[PDB]
Design a protein around this ligand. Structure first.
Ligand code: TPP
Ligand code: TPP
Ligand code: TPP
Ligand code: MG
Ligand code: MG
Ligand code: MG
Lengths: 554, 554, 554
């Protein structure tokens, strides 16, 4: 006897999901039962719904998509924070909420977990604001069409979507889903437009002296990584990254020239791109953070703006094809233009070295983490100064970096890494998280313990919101210190294999990392103590400009 | 010097539009100027915005898509009625509104044509409710992406979309649009799913004794007319239509068996479909009107439900392909199953004949209009008793019928026929419209005069809302009578070539139609006077069941 | 046996309504039946829902509030245009929509008059955008609370509100409404705040040399007319009006000094207010039209901004009392400050006179209408050049002017006058309407005929959108001319007592007005033919500034 909930489960499996995340509530228990009957995936549990959503977000990063299941209102609303995050970071997370019994609809009944009015369509209205698709299932017959619609839309658009299922309907008989090639289907490509866009770009490139490539944070969502480095091989030119695109290109590569981020770029790089004859700008996200208060925002006649969906070049916009198809086709026809690469040096990064027994230093933490990175590593870098020393690392080919520079929700780090680890258990997972950020979502380290995930967490204890102290200080930047290392035993409670360690000197950190690598059955939190004054120059420079731009009066 | 408004114009032309409809207002004048610079289409004008929207709707029916341009709030809101209509009737109308100067945004300025508050995002929020896409253009740089998004989404989904352009931005420099194959692009078809759906349907058909085809009102939007009659040729079986699908299948055809509409079906037809071994139900819209108060709604194991997007057959749903591709593929493999056709008669319709000089009769009007219909005719039938004698006509192969049975906005008839005529000037356009409906939108007959469109309008003057009088009578059903024939000279005003005639007897109607056919440079309104008591039995039967179902207490 | 619909009816009667306006549809028929059972009011019918809404709006102007009843979506959406209008013009219109059977809710049924999806909460979401309160009645038990909430909120806020009643629920048993003092209840007045505001204003006035009063278009909604002229009697100072406040002060008065409207003010008046020591600015609406493109917008330390709700004077805002209470209290304590009045002349208006047999002239039309005005007259002036010669009339004490300068929906004129006449049948009703505007809503003159309302309509036929031709001309300004006078017989159809006359010379107009005054049982339309070139200088001046401001690039 095949139910609506089973239909949902089988479709999620067809997406390529092996896990979904959940927090139980009476509105979703039966739905959770239906999902559990599918042995092709595991149902894993979170502390709260905010973390649950961000766990799904992290999973989407490594798997391609994700699903989280919550209860009505009290669960769903906080998960909408994570949904908005998924939208901001171009990740197809599917949020499924339990919903009131369909027989309660239009009766004037007031229900628990509602704001106390006779109707309760407010949740769906809120969800629409942060999703590409949002449906409320209230009968078994229309359920398949709705489920299929949200999933297919989410995957095609690389955006999150929302689902309601009335609690009494999860159990209802339902037709079975058919076999599929894939649940992802892009629109059929417009060949007239593709040809014209490639021709126009080739023409501009041919008459150029020194083209540069600038890579943006939508490159992965556009599924355009391989196509990009193929194009880079053909062009021979300099390849640069925007901050949020770290790890989207192999730094091993002959053409890699480093970070473009306005005045905090690697030396020479600002001049490289700002002055380019033909800037091949691929999948960028230009906002107030990435353009450094609108001071570093390349546009106009010399820019080839190549977005996931469309290409703008030489005063014309060409639409109706995928970025991936454009980059593949362009690589066939593009000329060799090496001038940019041969006129510039491979990026290097100066890190000040200390002695063994000196107090631990920001630069010294970066030096130690850099040495940890392998081709099999995923580095998660939290909002705060961790953004900036993420930029300062030389990452080996194959290594992955995860940033959340568009949403920028502090605390994202922890549950995100948890989900990400679930979705790629074969990789080494490393987290950089500030003390302030950790406090928002700390409890999710307990899930890492529960599920025996060997994540290495570098907790940067500098005693407050330093990214804010350096830029605009006030009493609001100072938080209650915790014994972060001591928190691991609390989550262990005599069961788990989590480790909590203090690093107070470079010697003490070197020992802590050795212990961490040996801890195969649980997370390792290393509380790194550095002085509040000891942040990157990069942060100070970037912050001053951004803050004065956000405070602008005219 | 190429502007945002010119970009919009060139994209509309690429859709295949040769006309757009407009009402001027200060928020859209510059935009209208930009559109006028494109000689590939004509800008035509309407009396009011409700009519403007319905004109676009009518144009979409004959052309494939349409566009209407209105001013902020005072224009846009009433056009949203038509937009909802377009959504209901699966037509990609694009509504473009003029909007306040972008420099007024966030200033706290109160603007004219707004509700008087400091912000005015209320319009876009309302538009989202009735569209598949809705964007507000407030800068030139993001304008192309937004324009392209609404147009492409509208065409793919066969749903209307909405656009804002800030009045100061219509003039702004803009990149040019690239060449395209087509602005329509469906998602790439899932071949695993298609194969399994066709295989499952063929298996069910093979073991069937008498399959029937039932055609619904989404058949045209799914662009599935030719594929349907190809399938009908292969299957040899009985082909029946739902009310709203009149004209979607040639009544000339050997397999045509008439109307399925519950208890108001053609004799034998209800038994034919209700009792079928395997009901091939194609692109249906099952609502309270079409299912006749939920009494005639075929579903369950014996039904092959083939929707624009998906197919449900034998307890499985198959998604990820177009209806058209499904129907083409099914026609290759389907067996011959003629039992349904050879066990039933070609539908006939009994019409009572009167004498020349007797007072005009409902049946006699149908008889006269039926004789007018050619393969080159488009018949527009208004909500009211005109729905019912539209059903009662035998239409020659090629003839088109236009119904609005999902939205059902009285008055739609007139502006809709106007737009439809604009979009197919080579065809003969015939309108059936009640006296009550005509009063809502009458003024648009003046546009037909202005643009010299030879539409023949049969105004059925029965002195009120008869469809309502017959079912649930009250003082609200009785309206002020007009001299409808005399109204033509009013719109002529010594310029135009409109004709207004009274038909009071069958002889008098026969003469009026002769005059109408001869009137090549303007519309002809024939005020047909029939008694209030003289409506179809079909209406009474249908009405009683529907009304008692809508008044149901449990 | 007492029903939900009867409850609604009795509450409407308690508002002081004697009429409600309706268009029948199956979703509201039973509701209409319930309302008809209340003999304390009359149910009157409209051609379409846009006109229906604007009829209610007009009724609210003379009665204080109004109600319109429409059917779901197809009716309600276009009525939302009128609702937005009511919000803009501060009038408590209650729109009541019929809605689907409550048993259809949450079933996945598709219903007629919907966009075709399984749910249909889109209407309520749209209504919220343009109302102060919006409720959907879906059970009998919560119906009283909801009805009482929308009505009370509407009246308190002077804003429109929205109601849904499920069609099956109009008939349901319901408790009866209790007796009331009034359905209007403002919040209890804050006496600390009132005292401080009056004290601060008196202090500023006392040390002033020449205070001026400037009256705005919210004066009537604030129910502050009598209080204003009491204050003017005490202050002895100059009293000036904003355009939209015409008729809110007796021009008979010793202190009346005319129109303040930037550069189109009466001579000297701009200097009077712009230069005032202490500008008592009462219930103003400052928008781009009233401030003449932001060039005439008095603010800062010298301005006493007295709004319906709050007073800002000398760098402090005082809230928590009604404008009426503030003005009453201020009149007790205010000093005499006559300087502004004795330094300026009573406003006069130069009108050029022609001969009897010369072609009719704009100035000559104004001269004739001015002579018609009595203390018992209500003048309705449409958007267009009619705004401007409304300003140019000297109105006798007691005379009423109706303007719609915030919404500015052309066509408003006609249905608004109809409703207004219904709500004050004892008064003489005069309409000024342009030819372009008349075309949008013309059919509602048929209702005036039906209900035997002796409205005198001056149709200004200047052959297009002249207000637009003078400012920014293009093909979109030119419309199909009608025989406007001939349209009356069409609506009469041998029944009614409407008159249609042409005025082509001043003699011919003088005769037409004589006929109009004698026509006691129907409307009289006088088609006044003037040249397209013959608009007010006032319009040209005002238009040029406003248009260049709306087209501003920075
Ligand atoms: C949910 C949320 N609240 C507030 C902020 C604003 N915010 C941005 S950074 C930041 C400080 C983070 O401090 P920490 O984790 O200690 O990193 P550090 O600056 O010390 O390196 C805050 C509070 C945010 N990004 N997200
Ligand atoms: C905008 C709108 N308002 C009201 C209705 C409700 N309605 C449906 S049929 C109908 C009667 C129209 O009668 P008429 O055009 O004279 O046709 P008849 O059946 O009398 O021949 C009405 C008022 C509607 N469908 N749409
Ligand atoms: C519903 C609506 N549609 C469009 C407009 C834009 N508009 C403002 S004035 C105007 C012209 C009015 O023409 P008419 O009534 O003849 O005035 P006149 O010739 O005296 O200038 C138009 C179309 C509007 N204000 N409201
Ligand atoms: Mg910190
Ligand atoms: Mg009728
Ligand atoms: Mg005019």
């Amino acid at each position: 006897t095949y139910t609506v909930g089973m239909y949902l489960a089988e479709r999620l499996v067809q997406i390529g999901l092996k896990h979904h995340f959940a927090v139980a509530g009476d509105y979703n228990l039966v739905l959770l039962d239906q999902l559990l009957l599918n042995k092709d995936m595991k149902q894993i549990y979170c502390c709260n719904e905010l973390n649950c959503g961000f766990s799904a977000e992290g999973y989407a990063r490594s798997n391609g998509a994700a699903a989280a299941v919550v209860t009505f209102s009290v669960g769903a609303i906080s998960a909408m924070n994570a949904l908005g995050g998924a939208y901001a970071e171009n990740l197809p997370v599917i949020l499924i909420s339990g919903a009131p019994n369909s027989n309660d609809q239009g009766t004037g009944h007031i229900l628990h977990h509602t704001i106390g009015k006779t109707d309760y369509s407010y949740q769906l209205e809120m969800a629409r604001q942060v999703t590409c698709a949002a449906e409320s299932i209230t009968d078994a017959h229309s359920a398949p069409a709705k489920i299929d619609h949200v999933i297919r839309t989410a995957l095609r658009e690389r955006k999150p979507a929302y689902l309601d299922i009335a609690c009494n309907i999860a159990s209802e008989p339902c037709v079975r889903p058919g076999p599929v090639s894939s649940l992802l289907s892009e629109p059929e490509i417009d060949h007239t437009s593709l040809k014209a866009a490639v021709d126009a770009t080739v023409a501009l490139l041919e008459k150029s002296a020194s083209p540069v490539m600038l890579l943006g944070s939508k490159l992965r969502a556009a599924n355009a990584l391989a196509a990009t480095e193929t194009l880079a091989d053909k062009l021979q030119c300099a390849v640069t990254i925007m901050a949020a695109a770290k790890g989207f290109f192999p730094e091993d590569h002959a053409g890699f020239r480093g970070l473009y981020w306005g005045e905090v770029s690697n030396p020479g790089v600002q001049e490289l791109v700002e002055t380019s004859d033909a800037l091949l700008c691929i999948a960028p996200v230009f906002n107030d953070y990435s353009t450094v208060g609108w001071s570093a925002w390349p546009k106009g006649p010399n820019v080839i703006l190549a977005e996931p969906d469309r290409v703008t070049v030489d005063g014309r916009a060409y639409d109706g094809f995928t970025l991936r198809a454009f980059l593949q086709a362009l690589a066939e026809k593009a000329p060799a233009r090496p001038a940019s690469a041969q006129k510039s040096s491979v990026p290097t990064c100066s890190l000040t070295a200390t002695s063994d027994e000196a107090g631990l230093t920001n630069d010294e933490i970066v030096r130690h983490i850099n040495a940890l990175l392998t081709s099999n590593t995923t580095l998660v870098a939290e909002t705060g100064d961790s953004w900036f020393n993420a930029m300062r690392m030389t990452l080996p080919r194959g290594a992955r970096v995860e940033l959340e520079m568009q949403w920028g929700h502090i605390g994202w780090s922890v549950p995100s890494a948890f989900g990400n680890a679930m979705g790629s258990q074969d990789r080494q997972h490393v987290v950089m998280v500030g003390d302030g950020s950790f406090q928002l979502t700390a409890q999710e380290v307990a899930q890492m313990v529960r599920y025996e995930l060997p994540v290495i967490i570098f907790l940067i204890n500098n005693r407050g919101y330093v990214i804010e102290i350096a830029i605009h200080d006030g009493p609001y930047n100072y938080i209650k210190n915790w014994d972060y290392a001591g928190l691991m035993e609390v989550f262990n409670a005599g069961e788990g294999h989590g480790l909590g360690l203090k690093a107070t000197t470079p010697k003490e950190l070197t020992e802590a990392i050795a212990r961490a690598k040996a801890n195969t059955r649980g997370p390792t939190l290393i509380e790194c103590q550095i002085d509040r004054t000891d942040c990157t120059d990069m942060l100070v420079q970037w912050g001053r400009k951004v803050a004065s731009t956000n405070a602008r009066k005219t």
